[PDB]
Design a protein around this ligand. Structure first.
Ligand code: NA
Lengths: 240, 243, 197, 245, 229, 229, 230, 236
């Protein structure tokens, strides 16, 4: 794992063909302390993350990692919070701009490819640093059904059956692949995402400790779940 | 502080995924005089421990409270010239909203816009992050009372109570004692002064001057300074409580 | 209004131009030279609008001179005519078009004598003989009548004299003196001015 | 930012441009490429370095580039850098032709590219082009010409020159067997194969020759075919064997 | 921005950032190109880290225009930049000449962009090598463009992890007169030389180019090629 | 654009890039200039396979002015061409041709600017500018990477400028400025003190053009130098 | 490396500090302001008999009533001299009058910290000017002599010396200067002090002398005039 | 060591050393004093000479009819800032036909001088000013510094040995508002004096005064103009 010149300071190749500054941006995602899970069902797509509000002095409704990009597209950001807000503003811009030029709402994959391409620029130009954050987008495609996409500070992007980001990403993915190996209803999809975050963080959740976001084939508008709606899922999982 | 080149630019991450230039800029706020803001049932109130650097200065020099818009107020902590440059940005942001949409900029929206001008200075070797943290307060019938805070990183959160500076944590454990959600701006002013006097270090620091401002139903949603009458009454209670 | 003429022989180019510099109804100058030596074997005869002529001709002259200094050899009459053409045509659709009408005479060691015609629009034509100005309407037919490609220089001067005499008899403009010059294997030779006293 | 700046356009304490000198080093690693001027024409002989069995051979050449109706060139160095420079050479030749309606005289085309190469050494903060060129041509002023230019933007006219791998050895070998004014394309082609044989570690697949001649008042540029080149190396092999006997 | 080059000549005469970009390519998943008599094949390893990935969502074998196709070894996000640029360049040619761009012409235009990132200020070279296939003037074409901006016309070649072995395999295994059907079987076999795991129609990707233009093979088409071992 | 200060002051008050540009001048071929009464002679120091015409270091800028150089040849070409353009642009603006001082002041101004503007290194050349003014006075000047310029009776620049200057200081007499051939002999004798077909001389007599003598003509003077000793 | 606009821990820009050190390498020049006019004198510092002494012009005329003495990098001075001459003629054009000595000195002075790298014009200065100037001239305020250095700081002087032997020449000036001394005595003191500080002996070729007095225009002393002074 | 080079670099202490180095320029200049009464604003400065033969540098410059300044630091930066102030004042009278309110001018100085403190390759202004003005809020004394921070002052002193002037201004602070012009100028002259070594006293050569107030436009007194004021001070 060698270094030569300014390969650990700027986005220029290392002797092994690596981009150390991009590698460091992945470590910045974990600096936030949070973990996020996203699962794709038969007729739905859910996103879930931790909701750490340590002082009662905060206004709990302003503390969020879930965002509405468009009416039918939502996202869960993981990493450096301001870097995350910046990416959400750009995602919103690119999406509104797309409908303006093309007369149709941006596909989930196109918005993910777009944000990923913007992120790649930072990976090639030295005068700026990558964003220390991970974006996961959900939405219902008119012809392809539910979609779950994620993009990296590296500029990579992909579609997923289920995905994770943050501190316990490795463990969350290990868990998510074990359940997908062994029918994905809306309840089955919500319960899986909640119990992935819970078993991986070893925390039996309270309704204020997590935030759930969902898109449904019946109602494709990105919906963020209430504490009561979150509790109805939490209690039904405990019944089992 | 990792002194190996990884901390000289905001376009450079350290191996553990940190941007030290932003952290060093946050340390300028950590060395600053404390500013506090409290959101209550009918408005938002600001109070600042404005340390008196010289007996030669005028009463009210170096105001750490600004009017960003007719309904928005700003309480700063950190490098004052950066703080005042952010006041001008926020002012122009509010001015541009009215020119675009014909009505007063919603506080959450102003906080979001200004926090992204702050964020922008945390990505490049070409520019320096702002060595400043600030709060925005507002009150309207439609939106209610709103208090937000932005840090050198560009993060913007909504608050019921907030403190920034040297005594950031000490002020917070005192603000936590108050049940603001059920209080008025006439009652909460007395408490803001009490908290600022408690948090002040008479030994390590020299004399200080208390700056008090508010925006609420009592002011018709306009950001104003607390009149001399009410300020003297709150300072009298703050000194009497200390004993 | 002004007059330019060229007659190319087998091994030379004969050129002549009026000597009048006139403003309004007055003849300000009787001894005005309208030919600009570009090279040792190239002359650019230029007429047209008030300022445009000296401005355009001198720009080309200094650029042909810069070529000589830069490369050690001169432009050929063909390259110098096409370079004149490129600049004139490039200004045509610009804010500042040049109203200049010209003839480029020259002698090349490889291609021999060449005479070119160019109007203000920058159309370039190689002609055995040419004329610019209202005078060309009275003299192109005299040249059509008597010009032959084997015309000796002595004969071409009698032909040029027949054209200049025609302008005295029929042209309403007073053009009494003309500059006469021959370009050949040995360069530009000044001949006696054809005068009408 | 000052920290990350390479300082590519600055002088060293002894009045040296290090980037220009390090670009020369790159050219020494590139294939050997020679040029020989003769009375009836001028030639270019270069070592092919794309010499693998699975290569397709879509183009007429590898190192030989036609620039003009009357001019061609060969390169030694960074091939992508050489593509930029040869493409610019073609644009300069057409800008001259459009303006004067005569083809660009050989030395003028070389100077124009050398002025771009020189600019890369004096300003901009960019690295130079890692290429040396050998130009062959014909013009109405100096006839058959052979030029050479390097990354410094310096150029010169030559009767025989070499650039690339073992350039130094080839110039000493060319210096000894070259006969000023008495050279013909036939004898110079024999000399080209004699030199490349010693400066390489040779078959028609490993070499690539091109000639510039004057046929009926028009210039003829032609890269020689494998069977032509094969006969020229077979002929050398015969004279070399009959030298010991 | 940073107006100075980030790729400079080392004292030995090497453009070290280009050498380091080639290392990124040599560590990428393997890719193969084979020029058959009546077509061209492009094959790659599309093996993802977990079952959770949706393989159908992103592609390694991409179309440029109707008759040109593309594949790579190296940095995935860098590749996407060159794909967009290549598709744009192919439209600029078609708009002017009203004729499908010759493959040599596309490859030279794409290779010039790659050279740009080795000299232009404040940028690093692309960490990718492309394998460009096409069909024009009734014949197939196979090119490779590397991070320096240099291009090569190949009859058959390998890139990425275990390319030295794949190239020796290709040289000995097949030559000219191969039919496109045969060549796809060869491309799959050269991928099998350095394939850790069971090969499926989801962890490999193939694209073909013939008289009918370029197109990516469907997983059902790849499945029938894998049925023949 | 590249906004970086290249030439700056060092703690001892030096402009190091200009002194490094003077070290590049010191490595160039020796150039001698002698100012006569009705003539001005410039001479330079000198491969068998090279074309002598393409490597000449005496250049005519215009009919009245011509110059010689020492240092970076590619740098010198850019200065020589910018001066050639300024001679014609001067005749276009003013009506009169350039005075030997005007173009020297011009070249010097260009040189100075490259020592004080961003992203540029100084020109690694010195020049000896000879000619006659419109009044007919013979003038010899000298410029250097800094931008400073002065007039001279005789001067030398390049590899061995110190020893040729020492010779010319002791040998520039009114007897040597008497006949045109004695002025030419001073230049050849001065160059013979550093160089060993190794000289290139150019002469300018009052109204006639710059005459570049041939090698046989040079050998005519070289033979008489050995005889007079 | 550090930026050209970097401050030293003492509060001075390093580039300006070093530009002042460059002046310590330049030829020594003296100026004396008298009721009867200002005198300017400078050593040419000739390095070869082959060099034309006339081609060294260290005393220049800015306008008919203003002269300039320079020291340091004489190529850097040539740019500021032209800027001064252009300034006087633009003022003459706009206002139909002459400039005061101070106004000209201030104009040249405004170009001093106009150097930099980032955020500057496409043809901006990278470094300061390594020159010191003495502006001696006459206006309505009488004879005036001004000093200027690379920091843009200009001051009015009764007597000033700049260059290699600045310390010594100023010491000598201080002991002999009186506010009511004649211009004849001012020239003599300058020529004596200049003779003292030079390595080479004083000659009519070796030095430059010039005066500006009411009722006369900036005068550059000829060899014949300099011989009768020496 | 590493955090000294550029203004965009924050030290691990949350400090910007380039800003602190620029402020050292103010501290190296000669002392200047500014003070105000209920009707007037006074500026006094010890002009310092480079030798007996050289003159004492101009320490006080005109900005507008109602505003005048005294400088301490880089004289070229002081002239850049003076022309910005003069121009901002011209704009206000051109547009509004009313003098630019002194506190507003000072905000513009704080705003424009902050810009370089946050851009790479840029440097702070190496000058600090004392501003004397008069408007609808009476007389004012302001202080600007390389930091881009500014202060509204009752009295003030910047430069070398200025801390000595500050103690006189703090001790006599109470008398300033009810002071007449002669007495207010005396308070300033006396604070200026305390800076100068016990070796030297104020002189008609090395003293500069600037006065603005209720009926007087900004006026600069320099040599025999200074004499009336100095004709009362004579102890220590
Ligand atoms: Na980057």
């Amino acid at each position: 794992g060698s270094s030569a010149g300014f390969d650990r300071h700027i986005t220029i190749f290392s002797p092994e063909g690596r981009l150390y500054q991009v590698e460091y941006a992945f470590k910045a995602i974990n600096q936030g302390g949070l973990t996020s899970v996203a699962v794709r069902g038969k007729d739905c797509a859910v996103i879930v993350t931790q909701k750490k509000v340590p002082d009662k002095l905060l206004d709990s409704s302003t503390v969020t990692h879930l965002f509405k990009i468009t009416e039918n597209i939502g996202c869960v950001m993981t990493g450096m919070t301001a870097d995350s807000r910046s990416q959400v503003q750009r995602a919103r811009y690119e999406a509104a701009n797309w409908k303006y030029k093309y007369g149709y709402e941006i596909p989930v994959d196109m918005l993910c490819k777009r944000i990923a391409d913007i992120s790649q620029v930072y990976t090639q130009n030295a005068e700026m640093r990558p964003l220390g954050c991970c974006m996961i987008l959900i939405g219902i495609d008119e012809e392809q059904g539910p979609q779950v996409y994620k993009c990296d500070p590296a500029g990579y992007y992909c579609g997923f059956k289920a995905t994770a980001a943050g501190v316990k990403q490795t463990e969350s993915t290990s868990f998510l692949e074990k359940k997908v190996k062994k029918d994905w209803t809306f309840e089955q999809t919500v319960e899986t995402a909640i119990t992935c975050l819970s078993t991986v963080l070893s925390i039996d959740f309270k309704p204020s400790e997590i935030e759930v976001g969902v898109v449904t084939v019946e109602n494709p508008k990105f919906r963020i779940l209430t504490e009561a709606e979150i509790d109805a899922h939490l209690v039904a999982l405990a019944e089992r | 502080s990792i002194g190996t080149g990884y901390d000289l630019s905001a376009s450079t991450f350290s191996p553990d995924g940190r941007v030290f230039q932003v952290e060093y800029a946050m340390k300028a706020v950590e060395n600053s005089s404390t500013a506090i803001g409290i959101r209550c049932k009918d408005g938002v109130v600001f109070g600042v421990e404005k340390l008196v650097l010289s007996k030669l200065y005028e009463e009210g020099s170096n105001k750490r409270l600004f009017n960003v818009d007719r309904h928005v107020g700003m309480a700063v902590a950190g490098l004052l010239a950066d703080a005042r440059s952010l006041a001008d940005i926020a002012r122009e942001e509010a001015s541009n909203f009215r020119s675009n949409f014909g009505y007063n900029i919603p506080l959450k929206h102003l906080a979001d816009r200004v926090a992204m001008y702050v964020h922008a200075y945390t990505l490049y070797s070409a520019v320096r992050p702002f060595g400043c943290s600030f709060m925005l307060g507002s009150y309207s019938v439609n939106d209610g009372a709103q208090l937000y805070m932005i840090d050198p990183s560009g993060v913007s959160y909504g608050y019921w109570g907030c403190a920034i500076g040297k005594a950031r944590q000490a002020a917070k454990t005192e603000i936590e004692k108050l049940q603001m959600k059920e209080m008025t701006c006439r009652d909460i002013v007395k408490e803001v002064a009490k908290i600022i006097y408690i948090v002040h270090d008479e030994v390590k620091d020299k004399a200080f001057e208390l700056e008090l401002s508010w925006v609420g139903e009592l002011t018709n949603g306009r950001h104003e300074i607390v009149p001399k009458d009410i300020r003297e009454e709150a300072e009298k209670y703050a000194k009497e409580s200390l004993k | 209004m002004e007059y330019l003429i060229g007659i190319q022989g087998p091994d030379y180019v004969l050129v002549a131009s009026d000597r009048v510099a006139a403003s309004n109804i007055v003849q300000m100058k009787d001894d005005h030279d309208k030919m600009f030596k570009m090279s040792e074997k190239i002359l650019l005869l230029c007429v047209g609008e008030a300022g445009d002529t000296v401005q355009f001709a001198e720009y080309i002259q200094k650029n042909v001179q810069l070529y000589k200094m830069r490369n050690g050899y001169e432009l050929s009459p063909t390259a110098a005519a096409n370079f004149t053409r490129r600049n004139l045509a490039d200004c045509l659709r610009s804010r500042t078009p040049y109203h200049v009408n010209l003839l480029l005479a020259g002698y090349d060691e490889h291609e021999g004598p060449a005479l070119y015609y160019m109007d203000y629009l920058a159309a370039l034509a190689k002609a055995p003989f040419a004329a610019h100005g209202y005078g060309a309407f009275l003299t192109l037919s005299i040249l059509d009548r008597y010009y032959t490609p084997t015309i000796s220089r002595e004969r071409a001067v009698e032909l040029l004299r027949k054209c200049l005499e025609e302008l005295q008899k029929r042209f309403i403009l007073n053009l009494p003196t003309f500059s006469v010059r021959i370009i050949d294997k040995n360069g530009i030779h000044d001949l006696d001015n054809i005068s009408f006293p | 930012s000052r920290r990350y700046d390479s300082r590519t356009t600055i002088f060293s304490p002894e009045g040296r441009l290090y980037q220009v000198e390090y670009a020369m080093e790159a050219i020494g690693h590139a294939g050997t490429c020679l040029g020989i001027l003769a009375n009836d024409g001028v030639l270019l002989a270069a070592e092919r370095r794309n010499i693998h069995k699975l290569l397709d051979e879509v183009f007429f050449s590898e190192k030989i580039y036609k620039l003009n109706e009357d001019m061609a060139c060969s390169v030694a160095g960074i091939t992508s850098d050489a593509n930029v420079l040869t493409n610019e050479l073609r644009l300069i030749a057409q800008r001259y032709l459009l303006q004067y309606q005569e083809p660009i005289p050989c030395e003028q085309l070389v100077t124009a590219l050398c002025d771009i190469k020189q600019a890369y050494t004096q300003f901009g903060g960019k690295r130079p082009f890692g290429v040396s060129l050998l130009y062959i041509g014909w013009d109405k002023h100096y006839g058959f010409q052979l030029y050479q230019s390097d990354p410094s933007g310096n150029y010169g006219g030559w009767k025989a020159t070499c650039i690339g791998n073992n350039s130094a050895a080839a110039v000493s070998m060319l210096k000894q067997d070259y006969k000023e004014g008495e050279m013909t394309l036939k004898s110079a082609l024999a000399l080209a194969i004699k030199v490349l044989n010693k400066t390489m570690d040779l078959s028609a697949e490993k070499v690539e020759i091109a000639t510039l001649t004057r046929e009926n008042g028009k210039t003829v540029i032609r890269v020689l075919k494998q069977k032509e080149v094969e006969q020229l190396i077979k002929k050398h092999e015969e004279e070399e064997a009959k030298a010991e006997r | 921005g940073y107006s100075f080059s980030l790729t400079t000549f080392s004292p030995s005469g090497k453009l070290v950032q280009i050498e380091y970009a080639l290392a990124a390519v040599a560590g990428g998943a393997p890719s193969v190109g084979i020029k058959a008599a009546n077509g061209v094949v492009l094959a790659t390893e599309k093996k993802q880290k977990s079952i959770l990935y949706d393989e159908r969502s992103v592609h390694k074998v991409e179309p440029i225009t109707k008759h040109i196709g593309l594949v790579y070894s190296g940095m995935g996000p860098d590749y996407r930049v060159l794909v967009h640029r290549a598709r744009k360049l192919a439209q600029q040619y078609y708009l002017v000449y009203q004729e499908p761009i010759p493959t040599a012409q596309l490859v030279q235009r794409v290779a010039s962009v790659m050279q740009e990132y080795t000299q232009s200020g404040g940028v690093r070279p692309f960490g990718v090598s492309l394998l460009i296939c096409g069909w024009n003037e009734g014949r197939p074409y196979l090119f490779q463009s590397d991070p320096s901006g240099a291009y090569f016309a190949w009859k058959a070649t390998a890139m990425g992890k275990n390319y030295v072995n794949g190239k020796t395999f290709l040289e000995k295994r097949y030559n000219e007169d191969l039919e496109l059907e045969d060549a796809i079987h060869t491309a799959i076999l050269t991928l099998k030389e350095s394939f850790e795991g069971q090969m499926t129609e989801d962890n490999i990707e193939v694209g073909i180019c013939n008289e009918a233009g370029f197109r990516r093979l469907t997983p059902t088409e790849v499945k029938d090629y894998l049925a023949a071992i | 654009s590249y906004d970086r200060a290249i030439t700056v002051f060092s703690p001892d008050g030096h402009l190091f890039q200009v002194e490094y540009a003077q070290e590049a001048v010191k490595k160039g071929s020796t150039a001698v200039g002698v100012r006569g009464r009705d003539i001005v002679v410039l001479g330079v120091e000198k491969a068998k396979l090279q074309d002598e015409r393409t490597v000449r270091k005496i250049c005519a800028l215009d009919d009245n002015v011509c110059m010689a150089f020492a240092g970076l040849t590619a740098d010198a070409r850019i200065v020589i061409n910018r001066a050639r353009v300024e001679c014609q642009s001067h005749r276009l603006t003013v009506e009169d041709p350039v005075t030997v001082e005007y173009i020297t002041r011009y070249i010097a101004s260009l040189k100075q600017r490259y020592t004080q503007s961003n992203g540029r290194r100084p020109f690694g050349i010195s020049a000896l500018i000879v000619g006659f003014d419109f009044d007919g006075t013979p003038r010899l000047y000298q410029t250097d990477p800094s931008g400073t310029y002065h007039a001279w009776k005789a001067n030398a620049i390049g590899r061995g400028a110190k020893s040729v200057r020492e010779f010319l200081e002791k040998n520039y007499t009114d007897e040597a400025i008497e006949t045109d051939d004695l002025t030419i002999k001073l230049v050849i004798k001065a160059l013979l003190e550093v160089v060993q077909k190794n000289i290139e001389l150019a002469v300018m007599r009052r109204d006639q053009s710059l005459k570049i003598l041939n090698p046989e003509e040079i050998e005519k003077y070289v033979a008489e130098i050995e005889k007079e000793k | 490396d550090r930026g050209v606009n970097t401050f030293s821990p003492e509060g001075r820009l390093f580039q300006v500090e070093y530009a002042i050190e460059a002046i310590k390498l330049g030829s020594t020049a003296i100026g004396i302001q008298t009721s009867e006019g200002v005198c300017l004198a400078v050593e040419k510092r000739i390095t070869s008999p082959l060099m034309e002494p006339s081609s060294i012009e260290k005393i220049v005329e800015i306008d008919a009533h203003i002269g300039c003495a320079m020291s340091g990098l004489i190529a850097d001075a040539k740019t500021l001299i032209d800027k001064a001459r252009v300034e006087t003629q633009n003022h003459w054009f706009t206002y139909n009058e002459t400039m005061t000595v101070e106004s000209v000195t201030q104009a040249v002075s405004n170009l001093a910290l106009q150097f930099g790298e980032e955020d500057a014009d496409p043809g901006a200065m990278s470094r300061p000017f390594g020159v010191a100037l003495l502006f001696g001239g006459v206006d309505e305020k009488g004879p005036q002599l001004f000093h200027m250095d690379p920091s843009g700081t200009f001051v009015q002087c009764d007597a000033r010396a700049i260059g290699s032997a600045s310390e010594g020449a100023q010491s000598s000036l201080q002991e002999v200067y009186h506010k009511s001394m004649t211009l004849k005595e001012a020239i003599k003191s300058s020529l004596i002090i200049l003779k003292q500080v030079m390595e080479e002996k004083l000659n009519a070729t070796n030095i430059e002398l010039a005066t500006v007095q009411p009722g006369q225009n900036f005068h550059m002393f000829t060899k014949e005039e300099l011989e009768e002074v020496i | 060591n590493q955090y000294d080079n550029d203004v965009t670099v924050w030290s691990p202490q949350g400090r910007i050393h380039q800003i602190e180095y620029a402020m050292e320029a103010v501290k190296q200049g000669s002392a200047t004093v500014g003070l105000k009464s209920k009707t007037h604003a006074v500026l006094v400065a010890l002009k310092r000479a480079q030798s007996e033969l050289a003159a004492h540098q101009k320490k006080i410059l005109h900005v507008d009819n109602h505003i005048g300044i005294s400088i301490a630091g880089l004289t070229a930066d002081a002239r850049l800032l003076c022309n910005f102030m003069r121009q901002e004042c011209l704009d206000s009278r051109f547009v509004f036909d009313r003098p630019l309110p002194v506190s507003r001018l000072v905000s513009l100085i704080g705003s424009k001088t902050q810009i370089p403190t946050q851009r790479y390759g840029r440097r702070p202004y190496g000058v600090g000013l004392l501003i004397a003005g008069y408007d609808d809020m009476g007389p004012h004394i302001f202080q600007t510094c390389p930091s881009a921070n500014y202060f509204d002052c009752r009295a003030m002193s910047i430069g070398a040995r200025s801390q000595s002037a500050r103690t006189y201004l703090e001790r006599h602070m109470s008398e300033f508002m009810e002071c007449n012009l002669n007495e207010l100028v005396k308070h300033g002259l006396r604070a200026l004096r305390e800076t100068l070594p016990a070796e030297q006293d104020l002189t008609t050569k090395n003293v500069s005064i600037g006065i603005v107030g209720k009926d007087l436009e900004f006026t600069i007194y320099d040599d025999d103009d200074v004499s009336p004021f100095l004709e009362g001070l004579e102890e220590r």
